[PDB]
Amino acid sequence: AAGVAAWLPFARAAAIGWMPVASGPMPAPPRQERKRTQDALIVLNVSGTRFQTWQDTLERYPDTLLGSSERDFFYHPETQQYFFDRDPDIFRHILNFYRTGKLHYPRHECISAYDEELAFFGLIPEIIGDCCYEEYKDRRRENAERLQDDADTDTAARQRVWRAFENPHTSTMALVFYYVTGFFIAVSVIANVVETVPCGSSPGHIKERYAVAFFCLDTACVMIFTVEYLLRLAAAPSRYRFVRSVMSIIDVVAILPYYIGLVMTDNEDVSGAFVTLRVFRVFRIFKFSRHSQGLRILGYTLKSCASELGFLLFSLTMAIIIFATVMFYAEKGSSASKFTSIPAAFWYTIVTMTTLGYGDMVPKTIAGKIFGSICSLSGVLVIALPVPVIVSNFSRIYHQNQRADKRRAQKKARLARIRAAKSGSANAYMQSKRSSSFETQHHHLLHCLEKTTNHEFVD
Amino acid sequence: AAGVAAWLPFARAAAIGWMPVASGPMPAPPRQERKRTQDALIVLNVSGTRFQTWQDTLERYPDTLLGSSERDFFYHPETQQYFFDRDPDIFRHILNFYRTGKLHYPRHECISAYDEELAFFGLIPEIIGDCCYEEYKDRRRENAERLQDDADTDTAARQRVWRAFENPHTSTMALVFYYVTGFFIAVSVIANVVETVPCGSSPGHIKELRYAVAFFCLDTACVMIFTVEYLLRLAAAPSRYRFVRSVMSIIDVVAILPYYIGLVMTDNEDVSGAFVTLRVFRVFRIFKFSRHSQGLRILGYTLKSCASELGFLLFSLTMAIIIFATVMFYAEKGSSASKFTSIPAAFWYTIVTMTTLGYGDMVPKTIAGKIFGSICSLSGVLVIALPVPVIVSNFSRIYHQNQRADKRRAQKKARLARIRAAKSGSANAYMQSKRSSSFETQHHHLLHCLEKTTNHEFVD
Amino acid sequence: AAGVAAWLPFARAAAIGWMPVASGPMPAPPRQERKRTQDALIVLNVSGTRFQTWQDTLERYPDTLLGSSERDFFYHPETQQYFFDRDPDIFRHILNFYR
Amino acid sequence: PEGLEQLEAQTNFTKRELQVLYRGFKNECPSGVVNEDTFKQIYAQFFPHGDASTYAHYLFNAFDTTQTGSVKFEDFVTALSILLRGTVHEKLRWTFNLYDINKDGYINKEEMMDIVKAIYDMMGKYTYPVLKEDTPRQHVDVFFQKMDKNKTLDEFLESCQEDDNIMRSLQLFQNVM
C-alpha cells in the first residue's frame, strides 16, 4: 500500500533474493535524493495548537486534500506552518488515520460536524473500520431519518379544498363535513346493531315493533358516504394511485354491500349471500379509519412487523397440529371421546393456546391431562413471543408521530426566525439609507443596484 | 448579514452584470482602509490554551459578544493577544460556530454549564443547526424539570396548624391524626361489607328464631367523623370554594352525601329501586385511603398522564367487540342451542374471549364460528396487551420521579445545613480577627467600618 | 462569598450610602497595596500544556490546596511556572469551578 | 461600554483597572445586565450576619434609572466610579438621591427611618449592645439633629462640610483603589 513507504527500501533488499536470477539493462534508480534521512516534522496548527507529522506520513495518501501541493493553499508563509481553520479534534482522528491507514469514529460527536470535517479534508466515509463503521452507520441512519422528517411536507382552486378536505382542521366547512360524516358512520353502525336486537327487528310480539324504517337509514347514509368518495374522485391528484391506496379500497369495500344486495335482490335470492351482506355491512367500523388517529398507527405497525407475525402464524400452526394429533391419538379411547377427529382436537388445542379454558372439552386420560398442560404452556410462550416486537413498533411509531409534530413546530419557529432576520436586514438597509466595514460595501452594492434600476427603496 | 463576508469580491463580479442596464450618477465606492483581507490571524488565549483564528471570522457576526469591540476588556495588550478564562473545549464549539455559522451540542457535557457558557458569549440558545437541537432540548427540559423539582419550596395562627395537620409525620400529632382516621375508614368499610353475610346482619339465620340492626349506628358515627374531618379540612383550606374542587375533597363529599340523601329519602316519598343504589354508593369510603396510600395517588396521576392512549384502547376494543359480536351472531344465529340470541348477547361471548377469560357458558358450534372465535381471542389479547407496557412504564417513571424528588429534598436540606455551618464559620473567623490572602483583611476592615457606622459590636 | 473578591471595592462605595450616618474613628484602610491593578496571569502547566489564571481567581478559595503558599510546593523555580504532575483535563474542571 | 471610550473620562478608572472591573462584573452576571435579586445576593453574601435585602433594594432603585428593571454595565460603572473616585462636593448628590425616596427633592421625616432600620438589621442578634426597639428611631432622631429643623438637600449639602467626620470619611475610599 501507499502508506507503508517507510518499508520501501526493504523491498530494495528483496532484489538480492532474485538478483542472481536478475539479468537485464537495470536502468538504475531514478535520480534518488537525500541519501540520509531528512524527515521534517512539519507543523499543522489548526485554530490553536499544533500537530507535527512526518512528510511521508502526510504524503502517503496524496489522493486526499493533505497530499500534493493542495495543502499549501492553507500554508501560512509568514509563520512557516500550516494554519488550517478546521476543528482541532477531528483533525486528530484524521492524523491517526493517516498514520494507520484506518479511521476510527469516536462515538461522542455530532455526525454533521464529523461528516463536514471529512468532506473538508477530502476523505471518503467508507474507510471506517468495522468496529466503528457499524456505529457510524447507525448514526447516519438516525440523522438521515431526522433530516428526512425535517423536509417531508409543507402546506402548499377547485382542487384547493382537497387540501382542506384531507386536512379538515384547516377550514370550518371541511371540519364540519368530517365530523358529520363520522357521526353518520356511527349512526349507521348503531342502526345496524339496534336492528339486530329482538325489540327492533324480531317477531317479539307477533300479535302486534318490527320497523322496516331501518331499511332506509342505511341507504341514505350509504349515499352520503358516496359523495365524499365521489369528492375524492373529483379532486383526485392521482386518478389511479388514489384507488391503489388502501384507504380507497376500504371505502369502496364498505360502500359496495348495499349496491350488491340491491342487484342481487333485483335478480336473484341467492342463499347464504344475504347474511354475507349483513356481515359486510359492518365495515363502516373500518371506514372509521380517518377519524381514529391511532388506527393508521396500528395498520402501519402491523405492516412493519410482517415477518414476525408470519413466523407467529407458522409456529402456532405447527404447535396446534402437533398437540391436536397427540391428544386425539392418546384420547380417542375415552368413553365420551369428544376428540372425535383431528379437527375436534384443533378446538381444544386452540382454546388451551391462549389460557382461555371452557371445560366443555377436556382430556380424561392420564397422558391427556399432562399433554394438555404442556400444550397450554407452549402456547403461552409461542403467543407471547411476538407481542414485544409488535408493541415496540407501535410505541415507536407513536413516538415518531409526536416528535414529527414537535419538529414541524420547530421548523415553523425557524422560518419565523429567518423572516425576522430578513426584516432586520431590510430595516438596517433602510436606516443606512436614512443615515461595520462590511455594511459599507453591502450598502454600496445595494446603491449600485438602485442606480442600475433607478428605483429607490422605501420602508 | 455578513455570514459569507469572505465572498464579497465575487459579488463585485455580479455588479459587472448590470452596467449596460444602469442609469445613475454612480456615487463610486465609499472607500475603505484596505481593499484586501490582510488582517492577520489573531491569537486568543482561553485559560492558558491559545486558539489562533482569523479576525474577519470574528467580525463576521458582530452582534454577539465576541463581535463589535466589547471583547477588548479581555484583551491583554502587554503581550498583544485576547485572553479569556472560560472552558476551552466548550468555547471550541462557539469557535466552530463562528467558522461555519451553525452550533452543535455535545451529548456528554452538563447542559446547565453549557447554558451559562452559552449566555456568557452573548449568543442565542437556538442557534443550533437542528442537528444537535433535539438532544440539546431534551437535556434542557430534563434539567429544567430537575431544577423545578429542586424548587418545590415547601414551607412549615391556624395557618401553620393546618399545615402541621397536613404534614404526614409530626411525631405526636400527625401520627395520631392519620392512624385514627385510617382506623375509622377501615372499620366503616368492613362494617359495610359484613352487613351482608347471613349470620352477620340479615334474616339468614333468624328464620328459625345475631341479626342486630346496630351497624347502622356505626355507619352514622363514622360518617359523622367523615363530615367533621371534612369541616376541619375546609378550615384548613386557604381557598374554601377552590379547594372544594380538590379530588380528595370530591371523594369526601361523594362519600358523605349518600348518607344524608338516604336519610332525607327515609321521610321522602319512596321510589322503587333507589335504596340499592345508595347502598352501592356506601362502599365509596374505601377511596379515602388516598391520604393513607401514596400508590393510589401515583396510579391516579398516571392515569391522568397517560389518558389518550387509554382512550385509543377503549375505542379499539369497541371496534373489536362490535365486529366480532356481529360475526359471531351471524355465524351461529341458526343452530341447535342458538345461544347468540342477539348482538348484546354476543357482546358477552366476545368480551369473555378478548381477555382470554373463558367460561364454557356459551361456545361456537359452526366451524367458521370456532375459527373466527379463536381469531377473536388472539386479536383481543393483542389489543389488551397493546397499551399495558406504556401504562407500567409511566407508573414506574412517576414512582421513581417522586422517589428521587424526596431524595433530593433531603439532599438540599443537608446542603442548606452545610451552608449555615459555613456562615457560622465565617462569623467565627471574623470574631477571631476582631479579637486579634489579602481579601480577608479588607473584608475585616469593611465589617469594622460597618460596626463603626452603627456604633455596635458583636459578641459570641 | 470569598469568590467574589473582584466586587469587594464596589462594597467600599456602599459606605457612601451610610457615610453621612457613619461617625467614628475610621481606622482607615489597612495599608492597602497596588492601587492600580497588577493581576498576573499566572501559568500552571500540568504534565504538558499550560493554563493561565488570575491570582485572585486561584486565591479566592484559600482553604483548598491551590490557595496559600501550599501551591508553591509544586512551583517550578527554574522555569517560572507551576508544573503540576496531575491529569491535565480534570484540572480544567477544577479551574472552571474555581472561576 | 466599548472598553476604551470609557477611559478615565466619565468613569474615573484607567482602562487596565476597567478591564478587571468588567471581568469581575461579567463573571457573576454574564448577561451584562444585572438583575435586582442578583444584586441582593451579591451584596448580602459578604455579610454572614443579618439580611441586606431592603438596603440593596434601595441601592438598586437608585442605580436603576428610568425604571428599566435591571442595570447594564455603563450605568453601573459610572455610578461606581462616581461613588469611589468622585468629587468631594459632587459625591453627595447621589447620597441625597439614596436618601430621597419620594422622587421629589423633599424630606418629610420618613424617607430616612426605613433606610436606618435596614442598615441596623445588618448587625444580627449577637450584637454587643442590644438594639432596643427604640434605638432605630433614636438614631433616626440623631440623624435628624444635623438635618434642618426649619421646613433638605441644600441644608445637608451646606452642613456636611461643617462636620469634619464626613469629609474625612470620603478620603477613606476616595484615594484607595
Author numbering:
A (entry chain D): 2 to 157, 167 to 218, 224 to 450, 472 to 495
B (entry chain C): 2 to 157, 167 to 219, 224 to 450, 472 to 495
C (entry chain B): 2 to 100
D (entry chain G): 36 to 186, 191 to 216
Paper passage:
Modulation of voltage-gated potassium (Kv) channels by auxiliary subunits is central to the physiological function of channels in the brain and heart. Here we report cryo-electron microscopy structures of the Kv4.2–DPP6S–KChIP1 dodecamer complex, the Kv4.2–KChIP1 and Kv4.2–DPP6S octamer complexes, and Kv4.2 alone.
The structure of the Kv4.2–DPP6S–KChIP1 dodecameric complex supports the additive contribution of KChIPs and DPPs to the modulation of Kv4s in the ternary complex. KChIP1 and DPP6S interact with distinct structures of Kv4.2 to modulate its gating kinetics in different manners. In addition, KChIP1 and DPP6S do not interact with each other. The structures revealed that one DPP6S binds to one Kv4.2 in both complexes through their transmembrane domains, forming an octamer for Kv4.2–DPP6S and a dodecamer for Kv4.2–DPP6S–KChIP1. In the extracellular region, two DPP6S dimers float above the channel core. Owing to the flexible position of the large extracellular domains of DPP6S floating above Kv4.2, the overall resolutions are 4.2 Å and 4.5 Å for the Kv4.2–DPP6S and Kv4.2–DPP6S–KChIP1 complexes, respectively. Structures of the Kv4.2–DPP6S and Kv4.2–DPP6S–KChIP1 complexes adopt the S4 up and S6 open conformation, like those of Kv4.2 alone and Kv4.2–KChIP1. Structural comparisons of Kv4.2–DPP6S and Kv4.2–DPP6S–KChIP1 as well as that of Kv4.2 alone and Kv4.2–KChIP1 further support the role of KChIP1 as a modulator of the Kv4.2 S6 helix by stabilizing the conformations of the Kv4.2 N and C termini as well as the intracellular S6 helix.
